[PDB]
Design a protein around this ligand. Structure first.
Ligand SMILES: CCCCCCCCCCCCCCCCCC(=O)OC[C@H](COP(=O)([O-])OCC(O)COP(=O)([O-])OC[C@@H](COC(=O)CCCCCCCCCCCCCCCCC)OC(=O)CCCCCCCCCCCCCCCCC)OC(=O)CCCCCCCCCCCCCCCCC
Ligand SMILES: CCCCCCCCCCCCCCCCCC(=O)OC[C@H](COP(=O)(O)OCCN)OC(=O)CCCCCCCCCCCCCCCCC
Ligand SMILES: CCCCCCCCCCCCCCCCCC(=O)OC[C@H](COP(=O)(O)OCCN)OC(=O)CCCCCCCCCCCCCCCCC
Ligand SMILES: CCCCCCCCCCCCCCCCCC(=O)OC[C@H](COP(=O)(O)OCCN)OC(=O)CCCCCCCCCCCCCCCCC
Ligand SMILES: CCCCCCCCCCCCCCCCCC(=O)OC[C@H](COP(=O)(O)OCCN)OC(=O)CCCCCCCCCCCCCCCCC
Ligand SMILES: CCCCCCCCCCCCCCCCCC(=O)OC[C@H](COP(=O)(O)OCCN)OC(=O)CCCCCCCCCCCCCCCCC
Ligand SMILES: CCCCCCCCCCCCO[C@@H]1O[C@H](CO)[C@@H](O[C@H]2O[C@H](CO)[C@@H](O)[C@H](O)[C@H]2O)[C@H](O)[C@H]1O
Ligand SMILES: CCCCCCCCCCCCO[C@@H]1O[C@H](CO)[C@@H](O[C@H]2O[C@H](CO)[C@@H](O)[C@H](O)[C@H]2O)[C@H](O)[C@H]1O
Ligand SMILES: CCCCCCCCCCCCO[C@@H]1O[C@H](CO)[C@@H](O[C@H]2O[C@H](CO)[C@@H](O)[C@H](O)[C@H]2O)[C@H](O)[C@H]1O
Ligand SMILES: CCCCCCCCCCCCO[C@@H]1O[C@H](CO)[C@@H](O[C@H]2O[C@H](CO)[C@@H](O)[C@H](O)[C@H]2O)[C@H](O)[C@H]1O
Ligand SMILES: CCCCCCCCCCCCO[C@@H]1O[C@H](CO)[C@@H](O[C@H]2O[C@H](CO)[C@@H](O)[C@H](O)[C@H]2O)[C@H](O)[C@H]1O
Ligand SMILES: N=C(N)NC(=N)NCCc1ccc(I)c(Cl)c1
Lengths: 97, 82, 95, 69, 174, 347, 114, 308, 99, 96
């Protein structure tokens, strides 16, 4: 495949590994989740644009809209977690062990 | 009568919202009543974005012009006089 | 679909975007329209088990148009042989 | 008096006039005394590249008329 | 060379991902994502996606990432820890850059690399469409088609966004 | 929650699932999962306590990660086939991602860790939706892409789920954790038979939904969430102990109860394909589930645990919870084996 | 797979219409009326054959009719035409509506003389 | 040649901002029955030079910041974005002719809020971060109506190209069919730029860095008012005499900018919750209703503009 | 290239002005939760969701060129009404209050 | 007033589009020869560079089908000067 697909696929993997290798801040994982979406948007746009598949041109927008609404829900849960323990650390979310 | 005294109250207390609802109401209703709405579809149709690929003449196409300036084919005389 | 409501009700909810050879705004074609068109018509109505073997030629051509992996491999081969020959002074590009 | 506010307004007005005047005159200088070609769509770009080839000097703004027929 | 602008942008794209994926303070992690988003728009612009590229700035960067930074200021951090002051972040950051560099060094030299999968290195320009002279933006025609072909897409997208408002109010009420 | 808003949120959950099941386009399938997840979070959060917040957060991260992997599979498929049709995938790497994404959504082992915790942290009524309705959408996709699924991967996920679900349930006293591990084990049977006969996946799914809905409804009727709370039912609603007994034995796959039928029909399909070791191993491992169902029957129905003095006050008040469809569900949970050939309606 | 047949370099030579886009823009409306027959025969060939190698002969007749079209302007209306397309050429968008005065002079000249 | 063109846009903008400070002081002065600067140079014409030099040789006394990187970043982003807003402006020709220039300006203006947010982080002060967040909330809120209003106007114009707004208004200013939108647009620009009566950052609340934030903010004031003139008071363009367009276009921008000063001199300040209500409960309802109206109006009148 | 040159010049000049501002001869020889309302968070989220709906509305100037005007107008008005509905929901649920 | 002016602007757009349609046959004919000349030129270079590479046919197709296939950029400018390739590739996107 083309060169760009190498780096775009790599960026998705890097953000996936970042997401699966949590640290402390819940916000840091939400950023890796949004990084995955960014690379998905770029990968889909490149494919759709290069192939001249015209009706699919709206698809990256729909992906952006739903993902952002999905990110809004994630931020709402982060603030509720932060209102409970005073931080967004993920090690506080262990009551259900 | 009951509705008339309702409108007077909102107009006095919430004129901004009364205007909003009225403007939005006109936007949903007027296109169905306007006599010019049909020309919007006609003009959009008449705009030639792509090439008009000619047909192969089989001898049974009396309604297809042989030349752009021939009297057959869609006309835009209605649009010029619009 | 798991429940084919669209076919049964005769309503097009999302089939219009499924393939690139479907109707497009202003008849804009996709770059691989003819290849997808040929592969779809070969494989129509015979099932994926049969299609994977009997329409293999069309799918191989279609995949070549999509990703151009063979074409790039051939150009990369001619490019290798030139910038090699140019070093041995055995080739002179035209004006 | 209020007309002692005008000199500062004149300076600011001259400052905001230079960009529009400079851009228009730089365009004429760089495009053979004509407006810079606007190519927003592929068709307009295709004609501009065709003009470059036809011009004979690799400038899309050098025009060739019936003299070249 | 300028012919490799897309590849160059995609290289920076990856480094930005290593930047925030190694997960420094979310203040800097947000900065790394903003830079990746801007570079991501640049890649999309060079494939003819003017409208799609500007949506990244307007929606992804000017919208979602502003709220991310806004929330970080309230609920996550106010002051940042010194960048790379943590061993794990630096180790991950150095690990990613070296992996990226080895990928780039070999593909440039060979005009093709095999990182798990086979990738060409001739240039992205080689796969481009050759003939074009329509008097419109095809990318714009497709997005405009959302209102004439995608009635279904509009309804479900419109419904989901309304539900997002309802749901978030329920979540945050307490 | 306002009762009107609760209904609207419930319909959005249902609509998200329906979109997945009627879509022929991968983007609309992904939209269905997104819509469904968006509307399920408020019902997990509806009692506003730290445990509910933790459950919703753990659920959000797991489902969001899976939906990203699903979209990645969809785009890889687009790269290598140039189309969006919901069917077999045209790239092995896309198939693995989509399969793992759906296994994550279903909670199959070894992506199972969230199911016991999320179920424990949300109300019984929310757990009922989580462990029943939420399986429909991922299973309906698996039903359509199974020709391209790697056989070794899907059977490995199935075997691990039956083992993990069986072993996990042995150590549980919380009723919601017991149900969660029961769910993991039962997803394993559904996916083991998927490569061979998808109809038996649907049969196992439907029967599992009926029995699980029965158990959750009976737990709600008495507001029981622990083994010891459930052991008081004999001194309040003796009938309920008999229904719980029968349903648990059915969930254990004992003949002649309805829960035998899916295990029986699945064994038949795999033997027809010359698969003998796998069905035998699965059936034996399913005895682990039968053990901790039997334990519940001992403390609930077959023995009378100690009571408390204040229970006498409960004798004077009627059972006022809706218990909707319980008489129908419990009868179908136990007495359907004579009607087994009716499984062809699913064909 | 076989070898892609390609016409010889001398099978593609022809007299090209070497005029700028504003010249073609100014002449387009009369050009479309005068050279319709070979033009539409060529476009019918392209959309039917879907192969540029198969319409090379008809493509050549497109040039000949266009060169003859312009040789006929140069022979009767050279000065009204030069004024017109020079006005078109000045506009950055090559607008028709800026040059109605010069367009009328050219239109009258071709109508009277041709 | 293009490099000369860039400088002949950047440099005049900075000088225009410098002398806007003089004009504002003198216009406010005379509306207050006084004169304003008239000693430092004739009619105060050297007052901006004195202020600029004074500010740049002042002690750059910054107390320790939370992060050095974002302390430098915030003003660079502010000034860089402000200069970038000018490159698509048709005056009558743009430095860069963008097919989607209108969308480009919306995108670039949505990033301006980062400079505010980063300033809050770098202040190393809890109280300054709260003021930065209050400012961001005001800005993004009024971004909502600006986007929708702009969309409604473009439905009569037909494209996102800024120079097409000139063609659309060849016969008539867009203020006439859209004066309800122009009203809300104009107030929204005031709220967007933290201008009185929306200057709550100042009400609620050095050296070169301060001067750079100030210059960027005043460059945005001029640019917003240029954009208002283009959007609603279209100047006729004669391609053979482009300077005639530039003269008339500049006059309209100066009058619009001077009206910002006029409004500052005339009104008290909104309370924070009251300007949030002005948008969410007043402008936004009308803007939504007017957006519906302007989607329908070209269709029902057969007045859809050309796509090119 | 022109646009990249413009952007480079704008931000490079901004960088230069910022550094010379910081440098001059002085002639001298000697992570938690802000006490900040949940209402401000709700403003940001509300902006975000509306900003996403504005993204869906931006294509409208192009969409008005379609021949399927009946469908285009119905979906355009549908999207704006639902945006108005969400505003009405927030309003009635006391979501636009500060007390 | 806006209805009158926008209607006139639609008529002006149709007149502009029709001018393009009149010219498209001539432009299409020119494009065909240019593509075929560029492919014929690349073939001659290939016949010389790969004149005896073990087993290399010259001008062989990668597609099973014999149908004409539109070449991509790499197949047309693959052996030409960089500035032509930049202009052919990114020139339109960068004109702005
Ligand atoms: C072949 C394979 C094996 C067999 C498969 C069979 C599958 C199940 C078959 C359907 C079973 C439906 C339930 C049987 C009816 C029992 C309810 C009843 O008779 O009460 C009369 C019912 C109300 O009685 P009730 O005293 O309030 O409570 C009855 C039970 O306790 C109410 O108990 P509930 O709280 O569970 O109520 C559930 C019911 C709600 O109860 C109802 O409203 C009755 C609806 C019965 C629908 C009949 C379905 C069969 C027709 C299909 C077409 O939900 C429905 O609406 C069912 C649809 O009166 C009606 O509404 C008549 C129907 C008017 C329409
Ligand atoms: C065949 C299976 C039929 C399953 C029927 C289940 C009916 C619901 C359970 C009956 C017990 C009483 C009841 O109505 O459930 C309560 C629950 C509503 O929640 P609740 O806590 O009672 O009050 C809400 C106000 N906060 O009710 C609910 O929320 C409904 C949740 C269950 C819906 C999913 C059922 C499984 C999927 C069925 C598809 C079958 C294929
Ligand atoms: C036909 C084809 C299908 C074949 C598969 C088999 C189907 C049968 C399973 C049907 C589903 C279970 C429903 C069983 C109905 C039970 C009702 C009953 O018999 O009475 C329960 C009894 C009454 O209690 P109560 O009414 O509250 O007060 C009594 C005051 N007079 O409650 C009590 O008094 C409690 C008594 C103590 C508990 C004793 C437990 C041992 C008896 C359990 C019998 C049921 C076992 C079901 C397993 C299947 C049996 C083959
Ligand atoms: C004795 C054991 C047999 C009892 C079976 C009873 C099942 C209920 C009767 C339904 C019969 C039927 O027609 O449904 C079968 C249907 C077929 O599956 P399908 O994916 O459509 O393709 C089949 C091709 N082999 O597939 C199914 O319907 C089964 C899958 C059920 C999934 C539940 C989805 C519920 C969605 C309802 C939405 C409306 C809310 C209510
Ligand atoms: C914060 C710093 C400022 C961010 C800068 C982001 C640049 C976004 C500009 C995109 C606007 C646009 O689309 O037009 C600019 C130009 C294309 O112009 P346009 O008329 O739309 O299309 C060409 C002919 N139709 O587009 C181009 O010239 C192509 C430029 C490609 C490289 C962009 C790299 C952006 C990296 C930013 C980080
Ligand atoms: C034209 C004929 C129809 C007239 C309709 C008039 C209805 C006006 C409704 C109303 O009066 O609501 C006002 C009130 C909000 O005002 P408030 O001051 O908070 O209430 C009193 C307490 N002080 O009550 C409210 O909560 C405001 C109503 C909810 C907000 C609806 C917003 C309208 C939708 C915005 C877009 C506009 C319409 C579509 C475009
Ligand atoms: C005309 C069609 C044009 C399309 C319009 C687009 C649809 C937009 C739907 C918005 C629906 C809002 O509906 C609105 O709800 C509130 C409920 O508080 C009602 O208002 C009511 O509640 C408020 C509480 O805040 C009270 O102060 C008020 O006295 C009472 O009347 C309004 O009477 C009604 O206008
Ligand atoms: C909460 C959901 C809210 C959804 C609100 C949806 C509001 C939709 C309102 C208007 C929808 C249709 O708007 C308009 O209606 C009339 C009704 O004939 C249509 O019909 C009109 O135009 C056509 C076009 O040729 C003419 O042939 C016809 O004679 C004329 O009556 C218009 O083509 C359509 O543009
Ligand atoms: C949460 C709310 C849920 C409510 C669900 C309501 C269901 C809504 C169904 C929408 C789809 C209706 O059915 C579909 O409509 C669109 C537009 O009218 C039609 O689509 C039409 O527009 C374009 C124009 O070419 C093409 O897609 C197609 O050529 C044409 O038919 C489909 O032919 C029709 O199948
Ligand atoms: C959770 C980790 C997520 C990381 C995601 C990383 C992105 C993955 C990109 C996968 C896209 C490439 O996927 C891979 O491409 C090559 C190129 O033809 C295919 O081709 C390869 O396998 C088949 C095997 O018969 C043949 O095509 C061929 O022999 C071989 O080249 C692979 O079958 C396909 O699996
Ligand atoms: C816009 C271009 C203008 C070009 C003009 C170039 C002139 C360069 C000469 C600068 C002379 C500055 O003069 C000097 O400025 C600094 C500003 O902090 C003052 O302050 C400095 O000295 C005092 C003590 O004296 C220290 O406490 C302080 O920390 C230090 O900053 C000095 O008191 C003043 O003597
Ligand atoms: N705000 C005003 N109108 N003036 C004022 N009172 N203070 C600002 C003065 C100022 C700030 C920066 C620069 I550079 C310049 Cl030249 C002048």
């Amino acid at each position: 495949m083309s060169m760009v697909y190498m780096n775009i696929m790599m960026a998705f993997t890097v953000s996936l590994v970042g997401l699966l290798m949590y640290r402390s801040h819940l916000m840091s994982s939400l950023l890796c989740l949004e990084g995955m979406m960014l690379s998905l948007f770029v990968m889909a746009a490149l494919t759709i644009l290069n192939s001249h598949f015209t009706l699919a041109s709206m698809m990256p927008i729909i992906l952006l809209v739903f993902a952002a609404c999905e990110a809004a829900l994630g931020l709402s849960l982060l603030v509720m977690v932060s209102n409970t323990y005073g931080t967004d650390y993920v090690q506080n979310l262990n009551l259900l062990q | 009568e009951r509705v008339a005294a309702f409108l007077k109250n909102v107009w006095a207390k919430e004129p901004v919202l009364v205007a909003s609802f009225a403007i939005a109401g006109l936007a949903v209703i007027l296109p169905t009543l306007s006599p010019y709405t049909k020309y919007s579809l006609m003009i959009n149709r008449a705009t030639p974005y792509n090439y008009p690929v000619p047909l192969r003449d089989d001898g049974n196409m009396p309604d297809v012009p042989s030349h752009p300036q021939d009297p057959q084919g869609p006309s835009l005389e209605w649009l010029k006089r619009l | 679909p798991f429940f084919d409501v669209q076919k049964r009700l005769g309503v097009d909810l999302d089939r219009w975007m499924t393939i690139q050879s479907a109707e497009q705004p202003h008849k804009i074609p996709s770059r691989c329209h003819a290849f997808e068109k040929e592969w779809i018509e070969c494989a129509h109505g015979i099932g994926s088990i049969r299609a994977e073997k009997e329409c293999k030629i069309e799918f191989e051509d279609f995949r070549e148009c999509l990703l151009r992996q063979k074409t790039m491999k051939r150009l990369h081969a001619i490019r290798r042989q030139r910038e090699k020959l140019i070093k041995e002074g055995k080739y002179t590009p035209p004006p | 008096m209020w007309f002692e506010v005008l000199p500062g307004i004149a300076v600011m007005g001259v400052c905001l006039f230079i960009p529009g005047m400079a851009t228009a005159r730089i365009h004429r200088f760089s495009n053979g005394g004509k407006e810079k070609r606007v190519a927003h769509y592929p068709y307009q770009w295709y004609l501009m590249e065709r003009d470059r080839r036809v011009s004979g000097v690799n400038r899309s703004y050098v025009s060739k008329g019936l003299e070249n027929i | 060379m300028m012919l490799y602008i897309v590849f160059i942008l995609s290289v920076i794209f990856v480094m930005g991902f290593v930047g925030f994926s190694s997960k420094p303070s979310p203040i800097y992690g947000g900065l790394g994502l903003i830079v990746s988003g801007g570079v991501g728009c640049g890649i999309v612009l060079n494939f003819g996606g003017s409208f799609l590229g500007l949506m990244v700035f307007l929606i992804y960067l000017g919208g979602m990432m502003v709220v991310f930074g806004y929330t970080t200021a309230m609920a996550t951090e106010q002051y940042p820890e010194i960048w790379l002051s943590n061993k794990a972040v630096l180790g991950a950051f150095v690990t990613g850059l070296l992996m990226e560099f080895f990928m780039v060094y070999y593909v440039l030299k060979d005009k093709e690399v095999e990182v798990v999968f086979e990738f060409n290195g001739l240039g992205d320009w080689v796969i481009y469409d050759t003939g074009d002279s329509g008097f419109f933006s095809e990318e714009a025609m497709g997005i405009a088609a959302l209102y004439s072909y995608g009635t279904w897409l509009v309804i479900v997208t419109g419904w989901s966004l309304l539900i997002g408002v309802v749901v978030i109010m329920e979540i945050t009420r307490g | 929650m306002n009762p009107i808003i609760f209904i609207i949120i419930l319909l959005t959950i249902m609509l998200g699932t329906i979109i997945v099941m009627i879509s022929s386009h991968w983007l609309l399938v992904w939209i269905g999962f997104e819509m469904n997840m968006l509307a399920i979070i408020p019902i997990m959060m509806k009692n506003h306590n730290p445990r509910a917040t933790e459950a919703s957060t753990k659920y959000f991260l797991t489902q969001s990660t899976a939906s990203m992997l699903l979209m990645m599979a969809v785009i890889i498929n687009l790269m290598f086939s140039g189309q969006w049709t919901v069917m077999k995938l045209f790239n092995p790497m896309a198939s693995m991602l989509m399969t793992m994404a759906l296994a994550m959504k279903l909670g199959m082992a070894p992506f199972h860790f969230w199911v016991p915790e999320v179920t424990q942290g949300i109300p019984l009524s929310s757990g009922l939706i989580l462990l029943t309705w939420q399986k429909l959408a991922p299973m309906s996709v698996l039903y359509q892409i199974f020709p391209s699924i790697n056989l070794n991967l899907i059977l490995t996920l199935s075997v691990l789920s039956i083992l993990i679900g069986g072993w996990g349930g042995l150590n549980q006293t919380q009723l919601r954790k017991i149900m969660a591990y029961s769910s993991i084990a039962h997803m394993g049977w559904m996916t083991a038979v998927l490569p061979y006969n998808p109809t038996m996946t649907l049969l196992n799914l439907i029967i599992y939904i009926i029995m699980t809905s029965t158990m959750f409804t009976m737990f709600m009727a008495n507001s029981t969430t622990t083994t010891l709370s459930l052991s008081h039912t004999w001194n309040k609603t003796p009938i309920m102990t008999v229904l719980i007994l029968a349903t648990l034995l059915s969930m254990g796959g004992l003949p002649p109860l309805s829960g035998f039928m899916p295990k029986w029909m699945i064994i038949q399909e795999m033997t027809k394909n010359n698969s003998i070791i796998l069905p035998t191993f699965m059936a034996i491992t399913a005895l682990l589930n039968l053990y901790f169902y039997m334990r519940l029957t001992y403390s609930t129905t077959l023995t009378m645990f100690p009571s408390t003095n204040n229970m006498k006050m409960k004798w004077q008040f009627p059972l006022m919870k809706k218990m909707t469809f319980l008489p129908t569900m419990v009868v179908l949970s136990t007495m359907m084996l004579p009607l087994t050939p009716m499984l062809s309606v699913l064909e | 797979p076989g070898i892609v047949e390609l016409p010889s370099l001398e099978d593609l030579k022809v007299q090209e219409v070497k005029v700028s886009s504003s010249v073609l823009k100014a002449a387009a409306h009369h050009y479309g009326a005068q050279c319709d027959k070979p033009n539409k025969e060529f476009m019918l060939c392209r959309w039917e054959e879907k192969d540029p190698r198969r319409c090379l002969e008809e493509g050549k007749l497109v040039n000949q009719c266009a060169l003859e079209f312009f040789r006929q302007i140069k022979r009767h209306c050279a000065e009204p035409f030069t004024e017109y397309w020079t006005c078109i050429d000045y506009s950055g968008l090559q607008l028709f509506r800026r040059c109605r005065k010069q367009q009328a002079q050219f239109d009258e000249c071709v109508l009277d003389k041709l | 040649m293009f490099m000369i063109n860039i400088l002949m846009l950047i440099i005049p903008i900075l000088l225009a901002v410098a002398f806007l400070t003089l004009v504002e002081r003198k216009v406010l002065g005379y509306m207050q029955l006084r004169k304003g600067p008239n000693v430092v140079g004739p009619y105060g014409l050297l007052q901006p030079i004195a202020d600029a030099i004074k500010l740049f040789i002042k002690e750059p006394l910054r107390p320790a910041t939370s992060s050095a990187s974002m302390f430098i970043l915030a003003p660079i982003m502010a000034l860089g974005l402000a200069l970038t807003m000018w490159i698509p402006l048709p005056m009558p020709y743009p430095l860069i002719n963008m097919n989607l220039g209108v969308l480009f300006m919306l995108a670039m203006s949505s990033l301006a809020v980062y400079s505010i947010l980063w300033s809050g982080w770098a202040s190393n002060s809890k109280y300054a971060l709260i003021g930065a967040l209050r400012a961001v909330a005001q800005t993004i809120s009024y971004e909502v109506t600006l986007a929708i209003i702009l969309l409604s106007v473009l439905l009569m114009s037909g494209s996102f190209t800024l120079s097409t707004l000139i063609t659309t208004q060849e016969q008539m200013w867009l203020i006439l069919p859209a004066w309800p939108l122009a009203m809300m647009w104009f107030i929204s620009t005031l709220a967007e730029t933290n201008r009185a009566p929306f200057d709550l950052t100042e009400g609620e609340s050095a050296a070169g860095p301060f001067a750079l934030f100030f210059m960027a903010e005043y460059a945005n004031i001029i640019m917003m008012n240029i954009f208002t003139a283009i959007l609603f008071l279209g100047t006729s363009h004669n391609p053979h005499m482009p300077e005639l367009y530039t003269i008339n276009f500049t006059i309209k921008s100066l009058l619009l900018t001077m009206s910002f000063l006029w409004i500052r001199a005339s009104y008290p300040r909104f309370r924070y919750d009251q300007l949030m209500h002005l948008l969410w409960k007043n402008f936004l309802p009308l803007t939504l209703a007017l957006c519906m109206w302007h989607v329908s109006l070209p269709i029902l009148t057969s007045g859809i503009p050309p796509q090119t | 290239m022109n646009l990249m040159l413009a952007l480079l010049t704008n931000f490079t000049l901004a960088t230069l002005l910022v550094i010379i501002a910081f440098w001059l001869p002085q002639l001298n020889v000697y992570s938690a939760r802000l006490p900040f309302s949940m209402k401000f968070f709700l403003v940001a989220i509300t902006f975000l969701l509306f900003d996403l709906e504005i993204a869906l509305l931006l294509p409208l100037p192009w969409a008005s060129q379609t021949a399927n005007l009946n469908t285009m107008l119905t979906m355009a008005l549908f999207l704006i009404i639902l945006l108005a509905v969400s505003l009405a929901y927030e309003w009635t649920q006391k979501g636009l209050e500060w007390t | 007033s806006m209805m009158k002016w926008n209607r006139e602007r639609r008529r002006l757009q149709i007149e502009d589009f029709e001018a393009r349609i009149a010219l498209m046959p001539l432009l299409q004919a020119e494009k065909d020869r240019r593509v075929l000349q560029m492919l014929r030129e690349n073939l001659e270079e290939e016949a010389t560079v790969m004149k005896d590479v073990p087993g290399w046919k010259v001008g062989e197709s990668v597609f099973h089908t014999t149908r004409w296939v539109t070449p991509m950029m790499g197949e047309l400018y693959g052996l030409r000067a960089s500035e032509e390739v930049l202009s052919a590739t990114y020139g339109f996107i960068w004109y702005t």
